[PDB]
Structure formats: C-alpha cells, structure tokens
C-alpha cells in the first residue's frame, strides 16, 4: 500500500478513480483500460476505512502521488474538509470478480419506471444511463448510497464488492 495525496470528485459515486502517472507505472505492461486498485482511508485515530476496490485510469495531467476518488464512495460527502491523503494499493496478478447478484433498495418514483420496463436486460441498462454503471468494468459495493434518499445497493453475492455482468449477474429491486 503506498499513500497518495486525496482530491474528492463530485460527479457521482461510480465515476473512475483518476490516478496520477508514477502509480500507472506500477502495474507494468497491464491493459490500461483494465485496471483496478483498493483504497483504505485514514480513521480519526486507530485503523483505517476497510478496503473499496475501484476502477482506475490513467490522468496524465495529475502532479505525483495523487489520486482523485468519489467521495459519494465513502460515508459522508465534504461540507468540511477532513484528511488529505489515502492508502492505494495497486491490483496486480489478480483480476476482480463478477458478481451473481445485486439487490438495490429504491423509492417508489425509481420503482415504479424500472417496473414500467418489462425486461431485466433493460432494467439494468437503464440504471447504466442514471447512474454510470458499466457492465464489467465499475465495481459496486455493499451499502452504496447511490442518491441520498432514491437508491442504495443493500447486498452483492457472493462477495461484498464486484463487477457487475449484465448479461449474467441478477438484479434483485426492492421497493422502499
């Protein structure tokens, strides 16, 4: 894990994480439209936040050690500053899984347009147009706040986080 210099994006949870070129260079010959990392954010005092594994790309324009992250990804958005750095670790000889299943807790007006949708194919495209959801490539998580008050993942199988394939995974709507 190496610590990189933190800037928040606020342009929806499951943009990229931006990642500046001395951490490109890390992975070596890796496909550059393939690659993956964890993050781990610094606790007000022991320990850090548990491990998110996200999507990255290259942003050549970024200065050293530096990493630009969504902060709808972790617990509260900033009305007030915080900490200024992150744990990254590169993901390197291992790929990220696909998922089985993704449950999503919505409300009622989210509901109701994805039941107006008599496929399940085109349920997920449609959230693939609200929210930048990209089949084998974002990775989403277990507790994702989508929008505060319309969407959140409530559970991924088998694992906690993964891609999301839309021809295979399952899409299990709960409404709220």
């Given at each position: 894990?190496?610590?990189?210099?933190?800037?928040?994006?606020?342009?929806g949870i499951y943009a990229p994480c931006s990642i500046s070129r001395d951490?490109?260079?890390?992975?070596?010959?890796?496909?550059?439209?393939?690659?993956?990392?964890?993050?781990?954010?610094?606790?007000?005092?022991?320990?850090?936040?548990?491990?998110?594994?996200?999507?990255?790309?290259?942003?050549?324009?970024?200065?050293?050690?530096?990493?630009?992250?969504?902060?709808?990804?972790?617990?509260?958005?900033?009305?007030?500053?915080?900490?200024?750095?992150?744990?990254?670790?590169?993901?390197?000889?291992?790929?990220?899984?696909?998922?089985?299943?993704?449950?999503?807790?919505?409300?009622?007006?989210?509901?109701?347009?994805?039941?107006?949708?008599?496929?399940?194919?085109?349920?997920?495209?449609?959230?693939?147009?609200?929210?930048?959801?990209?089949?084998?490539?974002?990775?989403?998580?277990?507790?994702?706040?989508?929008?505060?008050?319309?969407?959140?993942?409530?559970?991924?199988?088998?694992?906690?986080?993964?891609?999301?394939?839309?021809?295979?995974?399952?899409?299990?709507?709960?409404?709220?």
């Open positions: 894990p190496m610590k990189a210099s933190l800037t928040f994006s606020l342009s951490i490109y260079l890390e992975y070596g010959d890796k496909k550059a439209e393939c690659l993956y990392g964890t993050i781990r954010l610094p606790q007000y005092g022991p320990g850090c936040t548990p491990g998110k594994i996200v999507h990255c790309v290259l942003d050549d324009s970024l200065p050293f050690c530096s990493i630009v992250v969504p902060s709808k990804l972790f617990g509260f958005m900033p009305t007030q500053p915080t900490m200024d750095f992150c744990y990254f670790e590169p993901i390197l000889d291992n790929v990220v899984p696909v998922l089985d299943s993704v449950t999503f807790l919505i409300n009622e007006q989210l509901y109701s347009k994805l039941m107006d949708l008599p496929q399940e194919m085109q349920q997920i495209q449609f959230l693939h147009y609200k929210y930048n959801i990209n089949s084998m490539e974002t990775v989403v998580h277990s507790r994702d706040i989508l929008t505060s008050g319309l969407c959140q993942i409530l559970n991924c199988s088998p694992f906690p986080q993964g891609l999301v394939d839309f021809t295979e995974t399952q899409l299990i709507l709960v409404n709220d």
